């Protein structure tokens, strides 16, 4: 039977223990998500308390990280989602995504309505991925792809 959480700190504590294990084993997130059938981002978001793993993926990543039974079971719980400590990120890496919203949120609204119509892009019916790409000027670029279903507001 589906089980769900109501206090994010139970899964966030476990996130921290997972990350300590990961480090001691010198693991990558790519290699933890290998063999689960599930994208890097999805599996990583789960370890970090933001998705549920199916029973088999839970058992497999739990094997790779030496997790007790209670942990493997926590990973299959539907989480109380929300990874930002207090609304606005302090961490520069995370912050720059928030800054993208402070610069473009209204343009994104404006252009979503023009191209699709009244309503929203889903973050539920949704995938993302992060791709490292060569910058043609030297260095590297991240291509983060947000792929969500257009959901129209339709009048009643």
| Binding positions for Cl ion, rule: CB under 5 A | 40-41, 122-124, 129-130
Q: Tell me the sheet residues that pair with 127.
A: 147
Residue in 21, 2, 4, 28 with CA at minimum distance from that of residue 68: 21
Surface-to-core class of residue 23, CB atoms within 10 Å of its CB (0-12 exposed, 13-18 middle, 19+ buried): exposed
44 binds, among Cl ion, a second copy, none (CB under 5 to 8 A by kind): a second copy
Q: How far apart are CA 105 and CA 15, in angstroms?
A: 30
Cβ-based nearer residue to Cl ion, 124 or 133: 124
State which residue, 130 or 146, has the beta carbon closest to Cl ion: 130
Least separation in angstroms between residue 13's CB and Cl ion is 25
Comparing CB distances to a second copy, the nearer of 63 and 127 is 127
Shortest spacing between CB 60 and a second copy, in angstroms: 13
């Amino acid at each position: 039977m589906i089980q769900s959480q109501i206090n994010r700190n139970i899964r966030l504590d476990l996130a921290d223990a997972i990350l300590l294990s990961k480090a001691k084993k010198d693991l990558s997130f790519a290699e933890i998500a290998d063999g689960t059938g599930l994208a890097e981002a999805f599996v990583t978001a789960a370890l970090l308390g933001q998705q549920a793993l199916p029973a088999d993926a839970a058992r497999l990543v739990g094997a790779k990280l030496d997790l007790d039974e209670d942990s493997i079971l926590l990973l299959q719980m539907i989480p109380l989602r929300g990874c930002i400590d207090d609304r606005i990120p302090t961490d520069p890496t995370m912050y720059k995504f928030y800054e993208m919203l402070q610069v473009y949120g209204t343009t994104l609204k404006a252009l979503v309505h023009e191209k699709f119509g009244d309503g929203i892009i889903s973050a539920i019916n949704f995938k993302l991925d992060v791709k490292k790409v060569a910058d043609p000027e030297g260095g590297e670029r991240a291509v983060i792809t947000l792929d969500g279903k257009y959901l129209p507001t339709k009048p009643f």
